[PDB]
Each structure stands twice: as structure tokens, then as C-alpha cells.
Amino acid sequence: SYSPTS
Amino acid sequence: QLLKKYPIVWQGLLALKNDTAAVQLHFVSGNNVLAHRSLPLSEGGPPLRIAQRMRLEATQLEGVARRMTVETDYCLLLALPCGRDQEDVVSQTESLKAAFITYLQAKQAAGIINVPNPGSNQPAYVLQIFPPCEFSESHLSRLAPDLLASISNISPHLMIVIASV
């Protein structure tokens, strides 16, 4: 799973 | 150098937030066709943008290692800075150190780039972009110990694992 960068 | 054994297969710009860095990607192991198929054109196009990240934690890294067990399903690349002269190289290297390596280490993450095939909104390839870390040292030691010894704690770099999905 992933998460977005700022 | 020994970077003839690990040939340059891509040259271009990486992007992360409002930062960019010029890199050359050296082939280390796996299936080089995945690089040609997954990476963009670099003839002046938009930079290769990191817009997602994955935690450097057990199950995330196990997933990356999972795709690395057969040579046809992954590509392992080493990213090194480059520039048009020594002054440019220092600046691109400082960008790589400060805006990419330091950032990913501070977040304890790898960059993630999902590459789609046109017409399909299912990912065809994923680029997993590691800063120097325990995971990159493990696999570089296993697959290219000569290369690792020349860069470890010496030259800023990223490890890129390309997996076909």
C-alpha cells in the first residue's frame, strides 16, 4: 500500500 | 570505473514536489526490458515524478522482495547524479541529496511511481525508489557487491526496483 507525497 | 559492467539505460530528470534532479540509471540485475518498457522518454519531456510513497516497513518490503525472486519480473537500477559540467553536477548532486535522499530517509519511505498502459487504468509497472537504507544495502550486497562497496557511505544514489504487475 502507498500514500501520496506532499 | 566499474560502471561499464552496470550500463546506463536511462538518463533524465526525477521530480518530487517542487524539486528535480538529473540522474543516470545503471542496470544492475533482473530484466532490462522492463526499464525500456516502463520508463518515459527523456528527450525534453516532463520529469519522472514521484507522487506516492511506501513505508520502509516489514510487509511493504516483503512485497518488494517477493517480485525480485525471478529474473524476468523485475529490474534493479542504480540512480547516480549527472550534469553538463562540474558545476552542474555539484548542484544536481546536492538536489539528489537534499530533496530526494534526505526526504525519503526522514519519512522512512521509498518513492512509488505507478506506470499505466494507455487505455488501462490498471498499473502495468511500478517503480519503487529507495534511498540508501537497510533494504538497498541488502540487495546491492547480494547482487552487486563491487558496486555497493564503491558507493556505500561514499556517493549519493537511489536504488530503483521496477516490477511488472
Author numbering:
A (entry chain B): -1 to 4
B (entry chain A): 3500 to 3664
Could you give the paper's own sentences about this structure?
In contrast to PHF3 and DIDO, SHARP only required phosphorylation in a single repeat; double phosphorylation in adjacent repeats barely affected the binding affinity (Kd = 23.8 ± 0.8 µM for 1×S5P, 20.6 ± 0.1 µM for 2×S5P), which is in line with the fact that SHARP SPOC has only one conserved basic patch on its surface while PHF3 SPOC has two. To define the molecular determinants for the preferential binding to SMRT/NCoR, we solved the crystal structure of SHARP SPOC in complex with 1×S5P CTD peptide at a resolution of 1.55 Å. pS5 of the CTD is electrostatically anchored to the conserved basic surface patch of SHARP SPOC. The NH1 nitrogen of R3552 and the ε-aminogroups of K3516 and K3606 form hydrogen bonds with O1P, O2P and O3P of CTD pS5. The binding mode of SHARP SPOC to 1×S5P CTD is remarkably similar to the binding between SHARP SPOC and the C-terminus of SMRT. Both peptides occupy the same surface on the SPOC domain. pS5 of the CTD and pS2522 of SMRT are anchored via electrostatic interactions with K3516, R3552, and K3606. A notable difference between the two structures is electrostatic interactions between the SMRT peptide and R3548 of SHARP SPOC, which is coordinated by D2523 and E2525 of SMRT (dashed red circle). These acidic residues are also present at the same position in the NCoR C-terminus (SMRT: -YETLpSDSE, NCoR: -YETLpSDSDD), but are absent from the CTD (-YSPTpSPSYSPTSPS) impeding hydrogen bonding with R3548. The additional electrostatic interactions confer strong binding to SMRT even in the absence of serine phosphorylation and might explain why SHARP SPOC exhibits higher affinity for SMRT/NCoR compared to the CTD. Y1257 and Y1312 are not conserved in SHARP, which may explain the different modes of binding and why SHARP SPOC recognizes a single rather than two adjacent phosphorylated CTD repeats. Collectively, our findings establish SHARP SPOC as a phosphoserine binding module that preferentially binds phosphorylated LSD motifs with adjacent acidic residues but can accommodate different phosphorylated binding partners of SHARP via its conserved basic patch.
